[PDB]
Design a protein around this ligand. Structure first.
Ligand SMILES: [Zn+2]
Length: 257
């Protein structure tokens, strides 16, 4: 099935998921000189104070930190969004080396990694229903560069040893995702898709301009994870990113001047 390997990687996905060649696929390159400031964007609201993390799972293509989304706790609203979007999980994409790993690019620059906080529109009742709607999901994307350590990431990095292989999970309660945000909430936004199969075109992307810094030691530990299951030939979980897709008939809007 699909993956990031030599023979099942992003260039192959269209065979099982024809929408891979669709009109609003993600990620994209953000051309900073062409993105236009949009005065109509309302302020972004990230309300994570009541966030309830539950578990961390290696799903064979990334690790997801999963949240309790049975009630309105951690929510994203404002910005380009109408209504309320509930946090369900976050995960990362990263490279084999610091010079690649992000999905979105900025003037073709690739960051070492990219964090995705995934939220679904409560007007559709559940995540499964939401992904079938053009405005079903809101994904907050945050770039990672290598430099100083990110204290708020360390609890994540330290549990990775316990979920090395596909299908392993671990209890992961009381994790505060506010510790992963940069100082500024300046952002770019555009209509897009899931970046993994089924690649559904249901996502409003909100990509923050300010990267967070993580340490070499921290990202090194991401790269010790495995795509494979327990006991199988070791394939390091690295370069689990989809490259930039054609922008087509879309405009990227900036929240800032
Ligand atoms: Zn992602």
């Amino acid at each position: 099935h699909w993956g990031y390997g030599k023979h099942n990687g992003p260039e192959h996905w269209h065979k099982d998921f024809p929408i891979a060649k669709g009109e609003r696929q993600s990620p994209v390159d953000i051309d900073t000189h062409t993105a236009k400031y949009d005065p109509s964007l309302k302020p972004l609201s990230v309300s994570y104070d009541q966030a309830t993390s539950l578990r961390i799972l290696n799903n064979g293509h990334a690790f997801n930190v999963e949240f309790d989304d049975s009630q309105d706790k951690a929510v994203l609203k404002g910005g380009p969004l109408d209504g309320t979007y509930r946090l369900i999980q976050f995960h990362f994409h990263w490279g084999s080396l610091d010079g690649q790993g992000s999905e979105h690019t900025v003037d073709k620059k690739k960051y070492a990694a990219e964090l995705h906080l995934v939220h679904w529109n409560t007007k559709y009742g559940d995540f499964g229903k939401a992904v079938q709607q053009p405005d079903g999901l809101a994904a907050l994307g945050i770039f990672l560069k290598v430099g100083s350590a990110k204290p708020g990431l360390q609890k994540v990095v330290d549990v990775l040893d316990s979920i090395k292989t596909k299908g392993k999970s671990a209890d992961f309660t009381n994790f505060d995702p506010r510790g992963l945000l940069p100082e500024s909430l300046d952002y770019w936004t555009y209509p897009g898709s899931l970046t993994t199969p089924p690649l559904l075109e249901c996502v409003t992307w909100i990509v923050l301009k300010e990267p967070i810094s993580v340490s070499s030691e921290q990202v090194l530990k991401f790269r010790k994870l495995n795509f494979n299951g327990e006991g199988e030939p070791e394939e390091l979980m690295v370069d689990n990113w989809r490259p930039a897709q054609p922008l087509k008939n879309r405009q990227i809007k900036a929240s800032f001047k």
